[PDB]
Write a structure and sequence with these properties.
This protein is of the alpha/beta class. The protein contains 6 helices and 15 strands. The strands form 5 sheets. A 7-stranded parallel sheet has the order 4-5-3-6-8-10-11, with helices on both faces. A two-stranded antiparallel ribbon has the order 1-2. The PDB classes it as hydrolase.
């Protein structure tokens, strides 16, 4: 399948070179997989989700995304126009309030919730979790992410936007989950993107067009934006039978565009998420 005039990030993950505008992908599109978007919520109403998005848990007095961040992230995972895995099932877990903040105790509970709730759901091709969130180093937060991964979920987390070593951030610094840095449309490291040995992969993170609340769209930047590219790619690849939740991060690194990014500090991987789709 091919999507004409796709957002640059989607075109990027189906090309070996930057600058293209078509997203090439296998028509299975992540059907039969599920991605949990652990964030500010999802506006499931949005026509771009085509009924494939639903809230399953909230930690605040409402399950509505009053911010947009979570809806944007979910759109990059799985919306019809802006999504990597256009047929995946999307589950919203609202651990962040409408200012985009949340306590670590709440984020940990949300991760534990997904580890159990996936046993309530029909996800025959496997389960992914996208965590476009983080703060300072926490062993408890790292352990929660490691438990979610161990339970059989492919966990992708944002490296952070501090232009610093992600070793000092959580859950970015957890070794067993997939930590995602951000690049821009010219294959430069995004100016805000964290770096360091704990990063596993880069994804498109600067000027990413996706869904927004109120049935609209907008372009924003962050390692928050790169993480759902990788989470969606994982769901796409698990549907194709090419990998599993336990191995997807390594498989994505195995098959990444290698050495294409500039301003990568010494000791940080130079790998860019890539679907290697051959029509």
């Amino acid at each position: 399948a091919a999507q004409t005039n796709a957002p640059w990030g989607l075109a990027r993950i189906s090309s070996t070179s930057p600058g293209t505008s078509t997203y090439y992908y296998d028509e299975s599109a992540g059907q039969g997989s599920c991605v949990y978007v652990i964030d500010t919520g999802i506006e499931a109403s949005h026509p771009e989700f085509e009924g494939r998005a639903q809230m399953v848990k909230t930690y605040y007095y409402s399950s509505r995304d009053g911010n947009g961040h979570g809806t944007h992230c979910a759109g990059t995972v799985g919306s019809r126009t802006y999504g990597v895995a256009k047929k995946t099932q999307l589950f919203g877990v609202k651990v962040l309030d409408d200012n985009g903040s949340g306590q670590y105790s709440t984020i940990i509970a949300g991760m534990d919730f997904v580890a159990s709730d996936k046993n309530n759901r029909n996800c025959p091709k496997g389960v992914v979790a996208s965590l476009s969130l983080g703060g300072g180093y926490s062993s408890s937060v790292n352990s929660a992410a490691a438990r979610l991964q161990s339970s059989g979920v492919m966990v992708a987390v944002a490296a952070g936007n501090n232009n610093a070593d992600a070793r000092n951030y959580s859950p970015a610094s957890e070794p067993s989950v997939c930590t995602v840095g951000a690049s821009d449309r010219y294959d430069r490291r995004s100016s805000f993107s964290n770096y360091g040995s704990v990063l596993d992969i880069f994804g498109p993170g600067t000027d990413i067009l996706s869904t927004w609340i109120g049935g609209s769209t907008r372009s924003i930047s962050g390692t928050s934006m790169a993480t759902p590219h990788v989470a969606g790619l994982a769901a796409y690849l698990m549907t194709l039978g090419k990998t599993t939740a336990a191995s997807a991060c390594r498989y994505i690194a195995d098959t990444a565009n290698k050495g294409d990014l500039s301003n990568i500090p010494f000791g940080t991987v130079n790998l860019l998420a890539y679907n290697n789709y051959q029509a």
